[PDB]
């Protein structure tokens, strides 16, 4: 069981960016790409609902 509604995407996204800060290597941008790719589904819901995407993801991330 897991609570969806865009929560599963953002909660898996911020941890990947946190791991990249110490697991930099050559694949530092690879984790950042997957972190930004997971957040697109909340932004997709923002477009269909007609809300501001940046304000939505900024509030959820904060």
């Amino acid at each position: 069981v897991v609570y969806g509604g865009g929560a599963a995407e953002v909660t898996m996204s911020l941890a990947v960016s946190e791991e990249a800060d110490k697991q930099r290597g050559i694949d530092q941008y690879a984790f950042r790409g997957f972190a930004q790719a997971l957040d697109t589904i909340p932004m997709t819901l923002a477009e269909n609902s007609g809300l501001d995407p940046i304000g939505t993801l900024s509030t959820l991330k904060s």
Binding site: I26, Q28, Y29, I54
Partner: protein
């Protein structure tokens, strides 16, 4: 702290393509070269 600032971040990120293109034409790894551009510029203000 505005949406105009978020566009300026992409303005700064997209402007780094010129040394990235130089790395690919020279065969050097772009991330290793661009990582040195970030490491030397906080002290070196110009001519680096």
């Amino acid at each position: 702290e505005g949406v105009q600032a978020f566009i300026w971040q992409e303005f700064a990120s997209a402007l780094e393509v010129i040394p990235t293109t130089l790395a690919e034409n020279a065969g050097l790894n772009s991330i290793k070269v661009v990582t040195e551009l970030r490491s030397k510029h906080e002290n070196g203000e110009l001519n680096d």
